[PDB]
Design a protein around this ligand. Structure first.
Ligand code: HEM
Ligand code: HEM
Ligand code: HEM
Ligand code: HEM
Lengths: 145, 139, 139, 145
């Protein structure tokens, strides 16, 4: 669903992403900005304030597993339903996460990429990244359909 | 809006300043290119990059949000004319206010990295959600 | 809410009266069967058909909506306590309020087919939206 | 994905549905309850008031065509994506209708079944139909992914 210039721009910026920290700031910002999401992460411990959430080392740890999954999705853009089929089962049948919350995490991920690349995150680059997250959000929502 | 959220918004909007109209233009561009269904409400506009019309509209949206910051305690009354335009006249799908608010946050993060903290990010979302809600209140 | 909306709602909710609690139970039951993600907010409840607890809670929802109709003009100070419960303590996902409001409309339809006109359907949707907006205000 | 006993309660209630009315009734209520939807239907004429909309002749006639595509969707519950291939193409590429609105007509339809059928419309009958309309809504939104 991406052009050849789109796919190239996506892959060029992703290679520059601090795999260690972006994942954590994104899962952190979800829990702060959309606080109903904290009830699925009861056992990560102290999420009582903004500074607790961004300091909490289990949010940071788990944040790496989430960026890990997006990477894996980018590698297989023509077979997302296949790549996320197991995680879709986890989120949908076990955890019972409303698929509107998958859209929110993808949009927080786009805010986080803009915070880090500033001027380099041009409207055409954002617009290719919006296609990707809509792709992933929709692939994780498959077991509801 | 809470006292903290009000302070946090007046901080962030302060730093924006004279650039508000320029960021207003960028947010519209970002929305047209990312969410192309939104184009159907501007058939009478040249929507190519650096259009005179998108810059001129950027300012109008920017100047309306500045009014709203100044009148945060009396937002329903400050925007009631805009609310009649968007619901009664134009017939804007509510889902579209969410896509413009996202594209404003993406513009601010890219321009104010020092100021775009988790706490300020959360306050600015509440603020634009409050505006969207007044702009859809005739529905 | 417009004056035409206030009328339609007060008329429609007058003609429920004592049946109010019995209707609330049916709405909750419909929600649990139709949208099984909502069942996790009630681990401490027997969710089986004709459950003592769901009848009892059904009446607590109904009593809340009657006070709302009675205080239609000052809604945020008639429901203030329930936002804190739903938003701060229970962390209820905002999408779930649209699900209950929708099952609430399927119940009033199935029971008052003479008063469930299209103009009344629209007033009750606007009313339940308002109620939802207040309950989610602490977000 | 319905069970045998869901499918036979769905199929059994539909064969008593007044096809010449409920369709219009559904479309009419969508246009009154969610007024923004009226911008897609300007050529239909007078939508200014609830009385205008419900008695509009081009609404009732278009209601039959909608309920006619639902009737096709029940036949082929194993292949909705394909049944609605051409309607997804029209609705997403030509008309640019936000998928959030397919869900809204799905739910307005449920309020109408309830309105006509009453107590024969039970909570478990509803949970079956809720599963149907969601699948319809997803099938129609397929060209957006
Ligand atoms: C694009 C969106 C998302 C992606 C790519 C994603 C990815 C993942 C991955 C890779 C895991 C680890 C699976 C495993 O350990 O076996 C996971 C676990 C989890 N996810 Fe997500 N997720 C997403 C959205 C969400 C959202 C929105 C929520 C909650 C609101 C959520 C809640 C969880 C929870 C609770 C766990 C399990 C944590 C534990 O108990 O150790 N996910 N997710
Ligand atoms: C925060 C959200 C929004 C704000 C503050 C805003 C503000 C404004 C303002 C100040 C105007 C000019 C009014 C005038 O000329 O008297 C306007 C016009 C307009 N807005 Fe918005 N708007 C918002 C959201 C939207 C969205 C989401 C859409 C469509 C996707 C939209 C479409 C339009 C259109 C089509 C016009 C009329 C343009 C013309 O004919 O010159 N607005 N808006
Ligand atoms: C119109 C919408 C709603 C109204 C008017 C409403 C009203 C109420 C009231 C009056 C109470 C009890 C207050 C008391 O303890 O004295 C309550 C409790 C509760 N509500 Fe709601 N509610 C609504 C929506 C929801 C939704 C959508 C959910 C979940 C999906 C929910 C979950 C709960 C839970 C879990 C409790 C506490 C149960 C317990 O402690 O035993 N509510 N609600
Ligand atoms: C969710 C189920 C829906 C179904 C089954 C459905 C079905 C149909 C069908 C069968 C047609 C006729 C195509 C033809 O024969 O040429 C049609 C046309 C149309 N639909 Fe839908 N539709 C749905 C939802 C929506 C929604 C939500 C909107 C707008 C908010 C919409 C807007 C339209 C429009 C504008 C037309 C074109 C009419 C014309 O000008 O000739 N549809 N629909």
């Amino acid at each position: 669903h991406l052009t050849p210039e789109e796919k190239s721009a996506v892959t060029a910026l992703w290679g520059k992403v601090n795999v260690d920290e972006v994942g954590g700031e994104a899962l952190g910002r979800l829990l702060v900005v959309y606080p109903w999401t904290q009830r699925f992460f009861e056992s990560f411990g102290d999420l009582s304030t903004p500074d607790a959430v961004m300091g909490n080392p289990k949010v940071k740890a788990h944040g790496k597993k989430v960026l890990g999954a997006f990477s894996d999705g980018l590698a297989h853009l023509d077979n997302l339903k296949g790549t996320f089929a197991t995680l879709s089962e986890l989120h949908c049948d076990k955890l019972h996460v409303d698929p509107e919350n998958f859209r929110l995490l993808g949009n927080v991920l786009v805010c986080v990429l803009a915070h880090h690349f500033g001027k380099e995150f041009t409207p055409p680059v954002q617009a290719a990244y919006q296609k990707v997250v809509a792709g992933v959000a929709n692939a994780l929502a498959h077991k509801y359909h | 809006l809470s006292p903290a959220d009000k302070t946090n918004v007046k901080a962030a909007w302060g730093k924006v300043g004279a650039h508000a109209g320029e960021y207003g233009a960028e947010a519209l561009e970002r929305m047209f290119l990312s969410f192309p269904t939104t184009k159907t409400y501007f058939p009478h506009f040249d929507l190519s990059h650096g259009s005179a019309q998108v810059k001129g509209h950027g300012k109008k949206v920017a100047d309306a949000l500045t009014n709203a910051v100044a009148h945060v305690d009396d937002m329903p009354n400050a925007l009631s004319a805009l609310s009649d335009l968007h619901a009664h006249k134009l017939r804007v799908d509510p889902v579209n206010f969410k896509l413009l608010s996202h594209c404003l946050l993406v513009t601010l993060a890219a321009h104010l990295p020092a100021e775009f903290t988790p706490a300020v990010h959360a306050s600015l979302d509440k603020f634009l959600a409050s505006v969207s809600t007044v702009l859809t209140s005739k529905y």
